[PDB]
Design a protein around this ligand. Structure first.
Ligand SMILES: Cc1cn([C@H]2C[C@H](OP(=O)(O)O)[C@@H](COP(=O)(O)O)O2)c(=O)[nH]c1=O
Ligand SMILES: [Ca+2]
Length: 129
């Protein structure tokens, strides 16, 4: 897998963000995770966490997996990095997202993320509290 450049256009919620990629605005949905909707418990905290991570970064990058790159809603499917740190993993490690939506063929970072979810659950963080 390869990292590619992108720039923030605006935050949306814990697991979606609007980025400019190859010069075109696209909403990205984070691979392999599910944050609560803004309305649900920890929804606001997930949104805040992602918003802060992405806007504070100097360098945003997107990394597509081996399979489909856009979902049925036209959202890009990627791992998103903020100054070299993976947002998807960070959300799971903090107990602000569950590993979810693991489709065969777009699952390269599955067991990195499961390792993070185990450690969040062990610490009883947020969703696991
Ligand atoms: C993360 C991800 C979501 N999706 C689709 C499945 C779900 O369809 P449904 O909309 O029919 O439930 C929806 C979940 O996204 P959200 O959690 O953003 O709602 O997006 C994919 O197709 N591929 C993916 O990799
Ligand atoms: Ca969600």
């Amino acid at each position: 897998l390869h990292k590619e450049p992108a720039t923030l256009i605006k935050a949306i919620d814990g697991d979606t963000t609007k980025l400019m990629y190859k010069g075109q605005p696209m909403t990205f949905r984070l691979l392999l995770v599910d944050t609560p909707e803004f309305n649900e418990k920890y929804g606001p905290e997930a949104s805040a966490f992602t918003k802060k991570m992405v806007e504070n970064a100097k360098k945003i990058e997107v990394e597509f997996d081996k399979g489909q790159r856009t979902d049925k809603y036209g959202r890009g499917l990627a791992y998103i990095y903020a100054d070299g740190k993976m947002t998807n993993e960070a959300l799971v490690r903090q107990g602000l997202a569950k590993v979810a939506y693991v489709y065969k063929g777009n699952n390269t970072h599955e067991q990195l993320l499961r390792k993070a979810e185990a450690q969040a659950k062990k610490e009883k963080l947020n969703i696991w509290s």
